[PDB]
Design a protein around this ligand. Sequence first.
Ligand code: HEM
Ligand SMILES: [N]
Length: 184
Amino acid sequence: ACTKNAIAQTGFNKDKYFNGDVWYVTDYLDLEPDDVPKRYCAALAAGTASGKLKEALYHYDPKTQDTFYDVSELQVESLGKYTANFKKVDKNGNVKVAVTAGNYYTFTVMYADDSSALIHTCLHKGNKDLGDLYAVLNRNKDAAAGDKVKSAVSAATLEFSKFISTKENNCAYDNDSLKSLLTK
Ligand code: HEM
Ligand SMILES: [N]
């Protein structure tokens, strides 16, 4: 179960974050550790499409090759805090698993600048028991976490040394699919 009410960044700039571009997960912290594999690739695009706030997600397990995309129209709880009812899609936006009640994630932007971000997410999916997941994002898939985002990790009373990097998984991403999924 999730346990954190993450606080959104003071002064969060929504239009800059939701600009239609891609964010890569470089490091993550799962509070229920073997909730998720130790090795993993994830990325997202976030933007407004025809007036609607959207995210597109990509997950890839580099060992099993398990791959999935999702798209969601995000609902606002407060500035920097969203609820996302997701639908599983192929890379072209064709629906594989439709939106349903109880399949949603929350999404809190704790820190962001033009290049980096720290988010909290709580996933709800059917009758699964899932915990809090923090992710360090960068616009550059190979970027080491810098001082702004690492300080934000500290300010959240987290230890960056506990985060797991995604950099040794040889992750390769279809940025075009993520951008185009925002419209779907
Ligand atoms: C970037 C932020 C992230 C968001 C918003 C997010 C969101 C989601 C969503 C919505 C699903 C369900 C998709 C579906 O069933 O269609 C999912 C599944 C999953 N995510 Fe993430 N995720 C993120 C990052 C990660 C990372 C970094 C890992 C790390 C290992 C991860 C591991 C998983 C796993 C293992 C599942 C499968 C859950 C299951 O069905 O048992 N996610 N995630
Ligand atoms: N996740």
